[PDB]
Design a protein around this ligand. Structure first.
Ligand SMILES: CCCCCCCCCCCCCCCCCC(=O)OC[C@H](COP(=O)(O)OC[C@H](O)CO)OC(=O)CCCCCCCCCCCCCCC
Ligand SMILES: CCCCCCCCCCCCCCCCCC(=O)OC[C@H](COP(=O)(O)OC[C@H](O)CO)OC(=O)CCCCCCCCCCCCCCC
Ligand SMILES: CCCCCCCCCCCCCC(=O)O
Ligand SMILES: CCCCCCCCCCC(=O)O
Ligand code: SF4
Ligand code: SF4
Lengths: 61, 197
């Protein structure tokens, strides 16, 4: 082998990088599955109790 | 209900559904009312808080003018809704045909709009049943059938009826589809049974 120094970095386009980072975010969601379920239940119970609609009236008007 | 100043004579539709803090159960709302009665000293501050709660309601409460569909008096009133359910039918003094006047139908008869029996999708007669078909396929079927019976036996053998319960645009579209599209003049409504003589 001869002396070669330059590095041909792989051509990761915007689509591939976006897919990789979205997969990373999805994996982070997976690690906190129970947390995301609890937060969705948070929003559901707040909206049922009218707390979320109360704030919706607060910030809409 | 319309002329009452206070909430003394008020529709059950509003009851427990108008605002955000009014859906609280009475067994747990009355003690809160007594607490506030015994806490606030001047009506000004809690009155301002109630004005904020009115602004609260303003976001969730949609008040749009309409005209009753049932009979020909054409009474116009705002329909105070919260999403899809109808909370109140409030007439306004500015209403030309009725002002505050209303009947049981126009002011408490609008549950048919939210009725589960309402046909949400087009229905096509498949064999001996009504299949819930897509909008586009039903449109293609009706268009193709109408073209068939228009180019086979002529438009004169085509007759369409508009509803007297629908808006002016609706009946105009019926008659235009009959004449400006199909080419027939066979159009009528309930007025043939009602107001023709
Ligand atoms: C260490 C704890 C720290 C907590 C730290 C908690 C930090 C977060 C704040 C909690 C309170 C938010 C505001 C709640 C009041 C304003 C909204 C309101 O008025 O909404 C009406 C609704 C009526 O419900 P309805 O179902 O009847 O009506 C449903 C529809 O309105 C009609 O369909 O109110 C509720 O739902 C009650 C919500 C929870 C209130 C809790 C009050 C005490 C909090 C502190 C002590 C907690 C101790 C916990 C531990 C012992
Ligand atoms: C569940 C339980 C809930 C209990 C109620 C909680 C809230 C009480 C009202 C808020 C506090 C009221 C008391 C107060 O605070 O004072 C008392 C005194 C009494 O009246 P007075 O007869 O003595 O005098 C009359 C005046 O001269 C002319 O109103 O004043 C008032 O209530 C004036 C209230 C003014 C508006 C509310 C306070 C605003 C503060 C600045 C906000 C800035 C935001 C930006
Ligand atoms: C995600 C769940 C969010 C819970 C509700 C957020 C309350 C926002 C409070 C507004 C006051 C503020 O942010 O300064
Ligand atoms: C508050 C946390 C919001 C996180 C939202 C992440 C959405 C990711 C969606 C996707 O990975 O396609
Ligand atoms: S809005 Fe206030 S003043 Fe009017 S009826 Fe209700 S409690 Fe009484
Ligand atoms: S509110 Fe009553 S009287 Fe007025 S148009 Fe409707 S049904 Fe007729």
């Amino acid at each position: 082998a001869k002396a070669i120094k330059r590095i041909q970095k792989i051509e990761v386009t915007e689509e591939d990088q976006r897919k990789r980072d979205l997969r990373e975010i999805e994996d982070a969601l997976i690690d906190h599955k129970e947390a995301i379920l609890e937060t969705l239940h948070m929003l559901g119970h707040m909206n049922e109790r009218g707390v979320l609609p109360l704030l919706r009236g607060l910030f809409g008007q | 209900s319309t002329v009452c100043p206070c909430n003394a004579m008020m529709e059950k539709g509003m009851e427990g559904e108008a605002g955000y803090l009014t859906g609280i159960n009475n067994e747990t709302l009355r003690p809160m009312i007594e607490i506030t009665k015994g806490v606030e000293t001047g009506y000004g501050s809690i009155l301002a808080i109630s004005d904020m709660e009115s602004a609260m309601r303003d976001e969730r409460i949609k008040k749009t003018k309409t005209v009753c569909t049932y009979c020909g008096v054409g009474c116009s009133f705002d329909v105070w809704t919260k999403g899809r359910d109808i909370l109140k039918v409030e007439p306004q003094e500015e209403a030309p045909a009725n002002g505050i006047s209303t009947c049981v139908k126009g002011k408490f008869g609008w549950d048919f709009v939210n009725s589960e029996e309402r046909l949400t999708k087009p229905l096509i007669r498949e064999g001996d049943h009504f299949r819930e078909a897509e909008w586009e396929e039903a449109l293609l079927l009706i268009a193709s059938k109408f073209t068939e019976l228009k180019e086979a036996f002529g438009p004169d053998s085509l007759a369409f009826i508009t509803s007297s319960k629908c808006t002016n645009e609706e009946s105009y579209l019926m008659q235009k589809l009959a004449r400006g599209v199909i080419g027939t003049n066979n159009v009528d409504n309930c007025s043939r049974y009602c107001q023709s003589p």
